[PDB]
Each structure stands twice: as structure tokens, then as C-alpha cells.
Amino acid sequence: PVRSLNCTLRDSQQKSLVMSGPYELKALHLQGQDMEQQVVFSMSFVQGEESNGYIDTNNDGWIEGDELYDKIPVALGLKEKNLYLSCVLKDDKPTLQLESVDPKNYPKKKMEKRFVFNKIEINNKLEFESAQFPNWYISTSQAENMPVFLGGTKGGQDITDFTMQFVS
Ligand SMILES: [Tb+3]
């Protein structure tokens, strides 16, 4: 049956993802004490192909282990909340929502596309691209305590890559 793992996520500026009420996630730097606030995700490996390869990011004409990319589809649930991140059109732009779901039926191998993210990993850094809306990515703001959102801009001020910590 469908493979899954539990994990926390931090954006590339070390902001942890936490619940900001039941209806959204927010990102902020957590002092070691409040680290317990981190939302635990349940990442399941859904239907679709895994790709891998190398891109020559340091431009030396060769490949190195830190240039090996992986691309694999996943769904992101919130451990024991029967909620899934999902991408939907709201007021005409791709939007990130937390969607409640029937525990009986989830998770499954064949996720509806709104739930599917292409997890792209290179040198232990992660992007989560929307399968429904390509070129849109799970993103955080530079500022503190702002919502996690779906953003179609890379390299600007918004953060679009993360690291993952595996949880027991
Ligand atoms: Tb190289």
C-alpha cells in the first residue's frame, strides 16, 4: 500500500512551518523551546514517475553528487489532522489551501491532482511544485509569521526551497 513518512519542514532561511489557526500554515523562526510548535507532515508517495539526473550547477563541465536531482510526486498531509495541502484556483490565481478529508479513504496511491506536488530535491534542498499548476511552488515570505502560500515567482524575495527533517 501507499508509502508515507513523517517529517518537519523549514524554509531555506530557517523558518519553521507551524499551524496558524486550523485554516493555514505560517512560517517563523522558532527558538529551541517552542520547536515543538513545528507542524508534522505526512508525506505520501503518490502515482506518477520519478525522474533523476544531474545539472551542472558549478559549471565545471562535470557532475558531482551535489548536482544530482530527484523529482518525485508526493502529497502532503498534516499528521493526524485529516487535512491535506491542495492547490485550487481562487479569485483566478493558483492558491494553497488546507483541505479536510475522509480518513477512511486517505491517503491513497491515486491522489486527486489538486493534492499532488512534485518534490524536487537537489543537494538536500527541496522545492514542492504544484502538479495542477506547474511553475507554482509552495512558498514563504521573507518576513516573520506570514502564511505559507503558492507563488509563481522564483529568485525574488519569496522563498521557494526548504529542508526536511525526518520524524519518527
Ligand atoms: Tb559540476
UniProtKB/Swiss-Prot annotation:
Protein name: Interleukin-1 beta
A biological process term (GO) from this entry: positive regulation of T cell mediated immunity
Top-level taxon: Eukaryota
Function noted in UniProt: Potent pro-inflammatory cytokine. Initially discovered as the major endogenous pyrogen, induces prostaglandin synthesis, neutrophil influx and activation, T-cell activation and cytokine production, B-cell activation and antibody production, and fibroblast proliferation and collagen production. Promotes Th17 differentiation of T-cells. Synergizes with IL12/interleukin-12 to induce IFNG synthesis from T-helper 1 (Th1) cells. Plays a role in angiogenesis by inducing VEGF production synergistically with TNF and IL6.
UniProt note on tissues of expression: Expressed in activated monocytes/macrophages (at protein level).
Gene: IL1B
Outcome (variant: residue 144 to K): Increased affinity for integrin ITGAV:ITGB3. Suppression of integrin binding. Suppression of integrin binding
PTM per Swiss-Prot/TrEMBL: Activation of the IL1B precursor involves a CASP1-catalyzed proteolytic cleavage. Processing and secretion are temporarily associated.
Species assigned in the record: Homo sapiens
Induction annotation: By LPS. Transcription and translation induced by M.tuberculosis and a number of different M.tuberculosis components in macrophages; EsxA is the most potent activator tested (at protein level). In pancreatic islets, release is increased by high glucose treatment. In pancreatic islets and macrophages, release is also increased by endocannabinoid anandamide/AEA.
GO cellular component terms attached to this protein's record: cytosol; extracellular region; extracellular space; lysosome; secretory granule
Effect of residue 121 to K: Enhanced integrin binding
Record's subunit section: Monomer. In its precursor form, weakly interacts with full-length MEFV; the mature cytokine does not interact at all. Interacts with integrins ITGAV:ITGBV and ITGA5:ITGB1; integrin-binding is required for IL1B signaling. Interacts with cargo receptor TMED10; the interaction is direct and is required for the secretion of IL1B mature form. Interacts with HSP90AB1; the interaction facilitates cargo translocation into the ERGIC. Interacts with HSP90B1; the interaction facilitates cargo translocation into the ERGIC.
Regulation: (Microbial infection) Cleavage by S.pyogenes cysteine protease SpeB promotes its activation independently of CASP1. SpeB-mediated maturation of IL1B plays a dual role depending on infection site: while IL1B inflammatory response prevents bacterial growth during invasive skin infections, it promotes streptococcal infection of the nasopharynx by disrupting colonization resistance mediated by the microbiota.
Other information: The IL1B production occurs in 2 steps, each being controlled by different stimuli. First, inflammatory signals, such as LPS, stimulate the synthesis and promote the accumulation of cytosolic stores of pro-IL1B (priming). Then additional signals are required for inflammasome assembly, leading to CASP1 activation, pro-IL1B processing and eventually secretion of the active cytokine. IL1B processing and secretion are temporarily associated.
